Amino acid sequence: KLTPAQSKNPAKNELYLVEGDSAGGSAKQGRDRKFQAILPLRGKVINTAKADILKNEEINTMIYTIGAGVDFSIEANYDKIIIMTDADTDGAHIQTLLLTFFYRYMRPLVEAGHVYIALPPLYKMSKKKEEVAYAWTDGELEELRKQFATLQRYKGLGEMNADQLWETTMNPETRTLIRVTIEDLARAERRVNVLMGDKVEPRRKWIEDNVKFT
């Protein structure tokens, strides 16, 4: 069940999709309830690219709370659906999974420019007087360490506080978002079908030829 915003205005209200209840808590807490609504998912999301689907509570709810429908049709219900997942690597997998759902079904939504990815910190480093930085992946860390310490790593959103989540990754004044647009369809289909697809034979080759195991 969802924690919706006060005003019901499809022109400037955002839907925040979260990895679960624990994370969702911090979400609801640090947030401008005027135009920010928050919807938790139970962990990893059904691979929509692999009837099984619509019967899965987690997908069904997303559909209902958004309006539109799977066909689709648009303007309901928010001019932003933002995917906010843990900052770790499992987060990226959930991002991956959610996106192929939107791309597969809600395509125009994606084609439009209404699917966003939110980029919350992974590491926070600190040295009355305090100096603090944020890192988003291992690479970022080394330079931060060289600069500075105590290092904190958010094993999930529920681990940072209200003030932080807002100031870093929700407040539009100082936040930064990613906007997901598609610039082919052919390239898109080709890619999603390999990675998220069902065949594996190629997925492997894709890793082999493309995953730098340094």
Binding site: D21, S22, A23, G24, G25, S26, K28, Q29, K155, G156, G158, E159, M160, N161
Partner: peptide
């Protein structure tokens, strides 16, 4: 505690593997 530990709205505290 640092992280989500519920509130007055009654929202439930974040699982222990999260909090510190």
């Amino acid at each position: 505690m640092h992280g989500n530990n519920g509130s007055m709205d009654g929202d439930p505290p974040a699982a222990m593997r999260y909090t510190e």
